[PDB]
Amino acid sequence: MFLLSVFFPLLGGLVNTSPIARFLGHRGSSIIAIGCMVVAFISSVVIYYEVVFMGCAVSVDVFGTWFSVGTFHAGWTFNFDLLTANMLFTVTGVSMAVHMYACDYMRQDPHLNLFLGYLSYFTGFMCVLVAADNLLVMLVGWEGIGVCSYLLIGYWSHRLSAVKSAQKAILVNRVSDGLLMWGVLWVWYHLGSLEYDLLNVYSASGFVGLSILIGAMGKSAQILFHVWLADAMEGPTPVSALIHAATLVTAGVYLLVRLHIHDEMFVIIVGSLTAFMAGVFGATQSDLKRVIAYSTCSQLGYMMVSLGLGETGGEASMGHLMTHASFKAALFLAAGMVISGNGGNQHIARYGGSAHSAMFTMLTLMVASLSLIGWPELSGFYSKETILNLAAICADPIADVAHTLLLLTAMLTSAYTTKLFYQCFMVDFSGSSVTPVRNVLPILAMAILLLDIMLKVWVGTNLLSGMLFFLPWGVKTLPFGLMVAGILTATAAVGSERFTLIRFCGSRWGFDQLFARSPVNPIFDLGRITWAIGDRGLLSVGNLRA
Amino acid sequence: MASEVVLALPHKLRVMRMYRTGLKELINWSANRHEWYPRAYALRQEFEDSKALTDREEIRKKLEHGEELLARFRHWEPLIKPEFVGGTAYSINPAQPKLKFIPNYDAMDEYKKGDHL
Amino acid sequence: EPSWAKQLAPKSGLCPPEFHYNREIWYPHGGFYCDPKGWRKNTLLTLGGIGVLLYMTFSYSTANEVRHMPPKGWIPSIMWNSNVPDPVDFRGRKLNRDGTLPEGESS
């Protein structure tokens, strides 16, 4: 059962993209994709119960040695331990519902089986990433999900902005991939191996944690790397759900939790600044998918700070990752159903009422939104409150500012999520297209993720749930009051007259515009210099006329 | 200040474009359409208070000030219907143009299908 | 109409009638709204081949799984794998293969 969680989504992708799919068509390829995900989810459930609960890790030599020159030895080997089982359960369970949704959402697309094969490849490379036992097979998974993210973001290739969004995701992540590669070189040079179980670091040379942190900041879309994440909304809604829940953005946090070789000052500062920035960014957007994208960036900031706190903080970071994937995928699927019910419009000024959506879509948005804002005794309450209480008792003075930033971020999140519900359903109608979707497949796709939200409350992620870190009632129940403050403010729909702050925040602090000329235009101009002045000029040798 | 296109317009069409863009920017800055209706009424009453003017200098000063206001309050995220330019559904799955086909190209003039030297 | 146009597949019932897509192009994945006539039989045969691959990789995984620690209770891999060690619980006590405490401390 253990190799069935990794191979078999890759097999589904291989089937649906090869000339076998010429004989199946759309109708047969949908069956193949859904079955190939159901099998992998069943295998991951067995792996989860064996490794997490009964504590028996399994190591598999899959395809022998990859390459071995000198003392640099990379093998095709997996290891299934606690983190790997957690990640496999989360990835396969989310990707199954996203496949069941995409087989109905992209029904009218002309190349449906190609899209399903790309989704399966993306899932399989994520499984390869988390199942690897050494750094090089991890890099296979890293670049595989990067390539499949490029193929899926720029799926509608006749649209130029989608193509440029895919290229932007590739380039922004390529900077951090370079830094991560140099960090792998440092790690191997000063420890002698590439396998995770032999990488126990107490005191290393600083470049190790910094360069691995930069490589993780690329994929997890932290500060000065978040710019690709918002533009990745050019792709279809299943792509966004799988990018923001289970694949891609959770890979850097997984890598930092696995290695635990960071220096906590950088991690805490980057995470808290990212959380506050993405909180204020999502409060001032009107595109329905961009608000959810910025909430993803904000929660990744929370997890970054938590893994900065310590080993218990690393466990809480993995726990928040696991519970975040379910309600984030549910939020994106419900938003896709609302968009399709309103004629493709993504602006929240053109919604309202309870006619453009099913009852189940509204229930899904409500329950996932309540889990995200930390409503008591739902799924996100346990993990988010654990991170907040662990940040309130850290003995680092830097974590004092980080906790304040997290509390402000919590109020902002409960503001804009309540605004997303309020604009979508509570206000009067201001669109003109009412085509509500009530198909069986997307409704069952949403119901599965709501079942996982219930499961996280009933069965915890780890042993931290129910442990009491001893805090006064004032410190403990303040995030509930911040949630209520966000709800009351957003339902009052109040606004400020400070329009220059509004347009500074709504334009997202001008990061893209400043990047358009601080590295980008200089790279183009230095290329002009090296070609025209150097190759055609200073180094050019002419002819002798006679 | 207006762009080089709007500065080339006749005066009637210049004022009409200013009123139209003001209504659209009020749509962009509002939360809903039901928020937008009394702001649209107020903008209409604002233009009605300068209808009976004759002095071209006062007309020019009011026109230029309003164009400066519209350049200031240009929304960074305008509301565009999805299937038009700048919308989210523009240029996704267009019908293919007619592409020509050459049947059995390898079988035409075999043994002489390389590059000359 | 060209001579070779009679050999080509029509636009399928999934494709909108006003959509044009140059039917001469061979796409490796199937192309525009692919809907072959015998698709249910092909789907069943590909499901059978996938089941063959599933059995092959289940056998390979079972042959190559290494457990360096005994589990802390009964695991479902005991049913199909004979290399799974006997469970040793959280207190260090050796257990039976069905996951119960042996005689001397049971009931």
Binding site: - | N104 | A9, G13, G30, C34, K37
Partner: peptide
Amino acid sequence: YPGGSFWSEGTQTGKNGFLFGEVPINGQPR
């Protein structure tokens, strides 16, 4: 869906494009 259901027959017979641009001449083998 054609036929009124997901589980009906397919609706395409013949070549779904020509591999390598090769068209059969008079039904002869290539």
